[PDB]
Amino acid sequence: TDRVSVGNLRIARVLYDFVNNEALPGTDIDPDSFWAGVDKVVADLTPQNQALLNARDELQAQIDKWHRRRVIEPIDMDAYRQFLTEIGYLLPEPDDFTITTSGVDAEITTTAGPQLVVPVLNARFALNAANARWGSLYDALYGTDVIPETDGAEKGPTYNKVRGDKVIAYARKFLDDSVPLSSGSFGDATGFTVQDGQLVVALPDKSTGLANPGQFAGYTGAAESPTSVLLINHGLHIEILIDPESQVGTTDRAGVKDVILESAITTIMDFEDSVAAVDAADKVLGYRNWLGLNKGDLAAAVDRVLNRDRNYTAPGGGQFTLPGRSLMFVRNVGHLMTNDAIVDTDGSEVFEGIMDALFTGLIAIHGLKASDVNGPLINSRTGSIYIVKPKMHGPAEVAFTCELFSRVEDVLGLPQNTMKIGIMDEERRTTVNLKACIKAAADRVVFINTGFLDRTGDEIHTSMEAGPMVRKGTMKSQPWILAYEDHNVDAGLAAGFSGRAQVGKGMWTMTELMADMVETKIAQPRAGASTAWVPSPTAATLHALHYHQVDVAAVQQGLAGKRRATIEQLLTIPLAKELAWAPDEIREEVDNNCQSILGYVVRWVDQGVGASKVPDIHDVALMEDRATLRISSQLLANWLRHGVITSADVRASLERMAPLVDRQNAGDVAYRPMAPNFDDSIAFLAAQELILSGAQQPNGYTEPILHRRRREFKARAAE
Ligand SMILES: N#Cc1cc(Cl)ccc1O
Ligand SMILES: N#Cc1cc(Cl)ccc1O
Ligand SMILES: N#Cc1cc(Cl)ccc1O
Ligand SMILES: N#Cc1cc(Cl)ccc1O
Ligand SMILES: [Mg+2]
């Protein structure tokens, strides 16, 4: 083996070298003391990690039997509910409390805005996401379908003036709506000046300052004729670039060149469901990118660097600076998987979540400073490290994560509670015990959130034996999920999240449907979410519009003390009613789910890509993560289980959709087709396995199968 022995651990050389040569220097942590800490943390915490996974299996088996030994048509909720309490699935609700989490950056406690999630294994994307804190509104409007191509604003190889003009008008109305003038409209502005700590806007007729002068935040260049004017609204900045020289500014009545929005306030650098990392080499690539980001020297080759901070003149005089970069969280993997990056003496792989805490925590130290050996860029000015933890089931698993972070802080020599936690609410046993989960992390929690895919996957798997479930599309409006969304906001606010910690909602997946996003995604801040997930920097800029229209702080205040979801609502199983479906509707749903699986698995298994623009069955581009596999495979496993469809149906769908997916990947020079030799494609076989073995996977998790198939591919490719 190419391994290094440290106590009971045998560490992959690639990882040992990375940590010693790249991660450790500049941290003041003694290398041999670090590794001994790794050996000791792994040895101490592994058994409980194991015991927790065992508890999941034990609870699910009891729930499985419970549904099987039941022939009373509609389920008795009273009985079901007491049954869940009896087995310790539904724990008592704690007394009310407020979180004590301190040392938290302003982007999290206070500001409400868009949040990016990006695969850390892709340096270019990581870099763009980090630089996406400031983005052009003009770029976003012109380049997407928010401005229709009617009358006659079609895009083309060259600049369309008619289109640019609608871009301009759209932005002018946004300004009027956000930072209103005392009189008149920005549409008729002819110039901007700063006179006596105040913004002065020229109109043909008169001159006006702002309805609320407080919104004036700063400016660049001369107060005389500024190069830009900085506005603020709802905590978020707006920057009017004034430059009559530019090709856009030449046409503008006030010389305006662009409107720049503070967009991606925070960004999650992801080691989990948006990446494909199945061994030491993959983990090191990710860790190395996370390192370059924290040092601030990560640079990507097209033909590329992190942005510097932005310098302004305050309204009353004096220079100040605003961050040029999104504040970075890291999303570690959850409690389930092991990874061969480290094995013990007996050859057993080490828990990946435990490793992630150690290595991403170690690396994050660099982001708390700026130097020669450390790179010239900072992440947290309050001294915090921000880790999102996915896929936890209940408060014992939350407490275990907190204990893990405490032990890691010890090894790293960090103050206790440096490592803050974001609790993803994406498993049913967390949803119904959420107050307890927050309390378990009361001195660390900076974030909770919801999302469609994983949580619905868990919903299906948990009640697998209860009956056939409604269709995937129908799931988005089921009583359980609407109660889940509201209950998440209720819990966070009740725990005092407003002014302290983020309350997040899920990803907008339809990357090209930006008109639709702008029209509908406003529902999330309107529901009291201080953040929500966007699939790109362009989408972050556009989603930012919503936080200007909606006063999230005020919304949160109005919802205080409300109990909008009952536990009965949360526990309403999405069972289909009798005879819900025509045969062609059934076929459509099978094809849909088989296409989702094939389209995502083929890029994952063959190219190690876990996030990309994947055309769905109707050629709509979607940016989903691995959780798309979990929902899709569990639904099909469920329909198979209850005889909605046959094994022949599934196979035939798979064979139908495969050439389709092949066709959808024509642009890709590196692509290997699945059809017509289905049984020779590792990716096709993976897709089939996820479905046929779906019901048997722990909580419906796809990683054990997916990772195996990707390792199989890598090996075949090596020979
Ligand atoms: N898969 C899996 C698994 C692993 C451990 Cl260590 C315990 C229980 C499980 O289901
Ligand atoms: N072409 C073009 C274009 C136009 C505007 Cl108004 C903004 C960004 C662009 O790339
Ligand atoms: N930038 C960027 C980006 C890329 C992928 Cl593949 C996914 C999400 C993102 O924000
Ligand atoms: N859906 C979805 C989704 C996609 C990416 Cl790329 C990241 C996180 C998500 O929840
Ligand atoms: Mg998830």
3-class secondary-structure state, position 545:
helix
Q: Give residue 649's identity as a one-letter amino acid code.
A: D
The CB of 493 under 6 Å from ligand 2? The reply is no
**Ligand 1 binding site (Cβ under 6 Å of any ligand atom):** 50, 53-54, 57, 698, 704
In our burial notation (b when 16+ CB lie closer than 10 A, e otherwise), range 569-595 reads ebbbbbbbeeeebeeeebbebbbbbbb
Q: Under a CB-based contact definition with an 8 Å cutoff, are residues 582 and 555 in contact? A: no
Report the phi/psi class of residue 356: left, alpha or beta, with left for phi > 0 and alpha for psi in -120 to 50: alpha
What are the tokens at 405? 């972070």
Ligand 1 atom nearest the C-alpha of 54 is 8
Last residue of a domain, one of 262, 295, 330: 262
How are beta strands 445-449 and 419-424 bridged, if at all? parallel
The CB of 170 under 6 Å from ligand 2? The reply is no
- Minimum-distance ligand to the CA of 454? 5
* Distance from C-alpha of 390 to C-alpha of 332, rounded to nearest angstrom: 7
The CB of 159 under 6 Å from ligand 2? The reply is yes
Where would I find the H helices in 495-608?
Answer: 514-520, 523-526, 537-549, 552-559, 567-570, 583-607
Same domain, 442 and 533: yes
Using the structure block, give the residue that is written with the tokens 């090996």: 715
Ligand 1 atom nearest the C-alpha of 49 is 6
Phi/psi of residue 194, nearest 5 degrees:
-110, 120
Same domain, 141 and 251: yes
Same domain, 308 and 372: yes
Strand-pairing partners, residue 654, are none
CA-CA-CA-CA torsion sign (453, 456, 458, 460): negative
Residues contacting 543, CB < 8 A, separation 6+: 114, 263, 508, 517, 518, 521, 532, 534
Residues contacting 376, CB < 8 A, separation 6+: 296, 297, 370
Report how far apart the first and last C-alpha atoms of the chain are (Å, whole number). Answer: 19
Same domain, 142 and 125: no
331 is catalytic: yes
Query: Count of domains in the chain?
Result: 3
Residue of 591, 625, 649, 662 marked active site: 625
Same domain, 627 and 478: no
Same domain, 123 and 257: no
Same domain, 486 and 361: yes
625 is catalytic: yes
Q: Within 13 A of 235's CA, how many CA atoms are on the CB side?
A: 21
Q: Under a CB-based contact definition with an 8 Å cutoff, are residues 543 and 114 in contact? A: yes
User: In a mutational test of the pocket of ligand 2, which residue from 159, 246, 260, 538 has the highest number of ligand atoms less than 8 Å from its CB?
Assistant: 159
The CB of 125 under 6 Å from ligand 3? The reply is yes
Same domain, 433 and 535: yes
Same domain, 622 and 718: yes
Which CA distances in Å does 11 have to 7, 8, 207, 350, 571? 10, 10, 70, 10, 44
CATH of the domain at 703: 1.20.1220.12
CA-CA-CA-CA torsion sign (317, 319, 325, 328): negative
Q: Burial of 21 by CB count in 10 Å (0-12 exposed, 13-18 middle, 19+ buried)?
A: exposed
Ligand 4 atom nearest the C-alpha of 622 is 1
Q: Whole domain around residue 715: which residue ranges?
A: 577-719
Same domain, 251 and 269: no
User: In a mutational test of the pocket of ligand 1, which residue from 42, 45, 49, 50 has the highest number of ligand atoms less than 8 Å from its CB?
Assistant: 50
Last residue of a domain, one of 262, 296, 331: 262
Length of the chain: 719
H or E element, residue 281: helix 280-295
* Nearest protein Cα to ligand 2, atom 10: 139
Last residue of a domain, one of 559, 576, 593: 576
CATH of the domain at 105: 3.20.20.360
3-class secondary-structure state, position 301:
coil
* Distance from C-alpha of 387 to C-alpha of 331, rounded to nearest angstrom: 6
Same domain, 228 and 239: yes
Residue of 10, 288, 331, 603 marked active site: 331
Q: How was this structure determined?
A: X-ray
Same domain, 548 and 615: no
